[PDB]
Every structure is written in C-alpha cells, then in structure tokens.
C-alpha cells in the first residue's frame, strides 16, 4: 500500500469522513471502512468513498458468524465495492472457507484476523491465535492482520505465515503501537484516531511516513 | 418471548422480508435482524420493522471488535432503534464491558454469545465457553446465546447463567437442532431458514409453536 499506510476511518458522519480522507489522500491509496461509518452511513459509502478518492477499500467487518451467514455478509459487501473484507479466524475454518469462497467467486480477497490488539484479546484469543494463523495457511489465506501492541506475537505470527503472506496490524498510535517496530514484521500499518482525530490529519499522517521513511 | 419463538429475518431483500415477516407476526412478537438484511437494505429496516410489526428487535450483529469500535456499533444500533445487540464473548471482557456501557446509557440490552452453533464452533469457540460464560456472569450480563445443536453444552450454559438469566438459541431447523429439546434448556429458540425459506411461512411456524406448546 503506498507508504504502507492505511486509514481506520471510523468517523461517523459522512462530511467529516470525507474531508479527513481527502485531507490525507496524497500519502495513503488504502482506507479501511468498518462498521462505525457503513451502520451510520449507508453501504453506498464504499463505492462513494472508492470513486472519490480512487483507492482500495477494505471492510473491516471482522466477520465472526455461522458460515451461511458469513456468505450472505461477503456478498453484500463484495457487491458493494469492497476489494478486500477482514474475517476472524476464531470461530473455525469452515466459517473462514465460506468467505474465501465468496471472495473467489468475486475476484476479492479475505484478510484473516489472527490476534487482536486490544488488552481483552490476552483473554481467549492469545491462546488460539497460533493455531488460527496455521490453520490460515492450511485455508490458502495469504492476508493476514495481526497485533501492533504486541510486536513479539506480530513476530510469531510473521513466522507461521512466512514471508510471502501480506499482513496489515492495528493498533499503532492510539492504543500504544509504535510505526517502526510494527513494520519490522507487518507490511502495513492501520492507523486510525492518531490521524482522525488529530487537530491536522495531513500533517499527522505525514509525519508516520517520515519515520516510516526512515526505516 | 410469544411462543418461545424468534425469527431469524435474514432474506436481504426488504420485500420478502417484509412479506416473511408479516405473514408470521401473529406468531411471534421479537424478530432478530442481522448484517444480511442491514447491509443490503439499510440500518432504518430496523425501525420500519419495529413500526409496521410492532414486535421487538434484537440485532443480530455478533460485535466482535476492539472497545471503543464496540461502543460506536451500539451507539449506532441502538439510535437506530434496536432492542437489544448480540455480542461476541471471545474477544475479552473489556470489549463486552464496551457495550454493557452503552447499553445502560440507552436503556437497551445486550445479548452474550458465549458459544456457536456451527461446526467450526468446536475448534476454538467450544474450549474457551465456559469461561466466556463465567465472565458474563461477572460483568453482570443477564441474557445469553447459545447453540441448539450441541444441547449438553446448552446444559452446561444453562448451568453457569443460572435460572434467572435469559437463554436464546440459533441452530434449530436447518442446522439441525431440535425445538422441544433446544426449549429444556433455552428460554427461546431460534428459527430463520425453516420459516423463512418454507413454501409457507405461517404454516412451518405454526408447526414449530404446536410442537413447543405441547412441551
């Protein structure tokens, strides 16, 4: 992704989601869409914010139900323009099968959610994650998202799905990650509040890159 | 619940949903609504349903999420007029806590799902149930999902929650769980696919209700 960057934008009215991604256009062409913004917005707001901006979109829906279900959800996302969507991995690998073959049959592709970044992941996901990113790889997935608040697990989880695999993390800015050492083991970053909530988004996000630069 | 019954509405076309549930209203009285009608049709299904049907909704959108993205979707599904919100437990018990917190602001409920009903459920899920069971009891949480296709682990939820506690439960019909046998335990079943795909809505609830009224 250029710069390596990726917007969380969870901003949930739609002027303010597209001025702030407007502002912070010319250094990223990734913006992550989740459920904050399509649930206040509308679906058409991928396509609107896709059109506008001429950049990849990927829907963090982080899909996590029965694998009928899970269908039904990639479908109407795919048919909403997104190019990738997020699954959690954690409810089993035949709920992950059902959104990769949705993805198959659309041209898109899944992102797998390994472990979260949040202190509540140390719960029941830490424990799982290993086991959900080898049974990624076991599934064909070759996109992965993973912690930036825990650059070790990012590591392990780097390690299980090798080199070749894409893997995104969150949780830089905001809840404690730092740009540099995530992207030692990620090939992305999402950063969202440190950005959207910055008193100059554009300068904000100019200067990750710098750092990011640096590396 | 009225007859014990809930339906799943998850046609993504609002006319036969419209249709589907009008023609089994008089048998039920709450209707859970997920992302496939929500992201085909849009969140103010949720209040053109509770309008016209006038029976409860809970949404059905199994958040699964970081805090503070949790707390944003139900502040969003509440405004939208939702009754209740389903929950993911795996993620941890701060991001439940997240929408415990909005759930109080808006005198609205939530809904924790503590184990699947699909196979995958066993890989990771089933492990770690009984604990993200013991935590909603922890954080006060008085309504619970749980799966109609395993009834000794919906045992053994009924088990940690209590009596007092509220028990809904997917997976009855299609997936095939048992109604009578699901009801020993839950308060509620679950029912989408047998009603809503049946050549005769009214007729395949009715059938389901005699079937419970005999219990």
Same mark, same amino acid.
């Given at each position: 992704?250029?710069?390596?960057?990726?917007?969380?934008? *969870?901003?949930?009215?739609?002027?303010?989601?597209?001025?702030?991604?407007?502002?912070?256009?010319?250094?990223?062409?990734?913006?992550?869409?989740?459920?904050?913004?399509?649930?206040?917005?509308?679906?058409?707001? =991928?396509?609107? !914010?896709?059109?506008?901006?001429? &950049?990849? =979109?990927?829907? *963090? !829906?982080?899909?996590?139900?029965?694998?009928?279900?899970?269908?039904?959800? &990639?479908?109407?996302? +795919?048919?909403?323009?997104? *190019?990738?969507?997020?699954? #959690?991995?954690?409810?089993?690998?035949?709920?992950?099968?059902? &959104?990769?073959?949705?993805?198959?049959?659309?041209?898109?592709?899944?992102?797998?959610?390994?472990?979260?970044? #949040?202190?509540?992941?140390?719960?029941? =996901?830490?424990?799982?994650? *290993?086991?959900?990113?080898?049974?990624?790889?076991?599934?064909?997935?070759?996109?992965?998202?993973?912690?930036?608040?825990?650059?070790?697990?990012?590591?392990?989880?780097?390690?299980?799905?090798?080199?070749?695999? +894409?893997? =995104?993390?969150?949780?830089?800015?905001?809840?404690?990650?730092?740009?540099?050492?995530?992207?030692? +083991?990620?090939?992305?970053?999402?950063?969202?509040?440190?950005?959207?909530?910055?008193?100059?988004?554009?300068?904000?996000?100019?200067?990750?890159?710098?750092?990011?630069?640096?590396?």
């Amino acid at each position: 992704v250029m710069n390596r960057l990726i917007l969380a934008m *969870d901003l949930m009215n739609r002027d303010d989601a597209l001025r702030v991604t407007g502002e912070v256009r010319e250094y990223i062409d990734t913006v992550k869409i989740g459920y904050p913004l399509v649930l206040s917005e509308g679906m058409d707001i =991928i396509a609107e !914010f896709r059109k506008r901006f001429g &950049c990849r =979109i990927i829907a *963090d !829906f982080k899909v996590a139900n029965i694998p009928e279900t899970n269908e039904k959800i &990639c479908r109407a996302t +795919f048919k909403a323009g997104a *190019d990738a969507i997020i699954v #959690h991995g954690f409810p089993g690998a035949d709920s992950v099968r059902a &959104c990769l073959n949705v993805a198959e049959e659309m041209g898109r592709e899944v992102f797998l959610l390994t472990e979260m970044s #949040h202190p509540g992941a140390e719960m029941f =996901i830490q424990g799982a994650a *290993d086991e959900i990113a080898r049974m990624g790889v076991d599934l064909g997935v070759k996109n992965y998202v993973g912690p930036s608040t825990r650059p070790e697990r990012l590591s392990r989880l780097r390690e299980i799905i090798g080199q070749d695999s +894409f893997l =995104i993390s969150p949780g830089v800015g905001a809840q404690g990650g730092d740009p540099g050492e995530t992207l030692r +083991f990620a090939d992305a970053i999402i950063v969202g509040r440190s950005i959207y909530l910055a008193d100059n988004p554009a300068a904000a996000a100019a200067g990750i890159i710098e750092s990011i630069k640096d590396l």
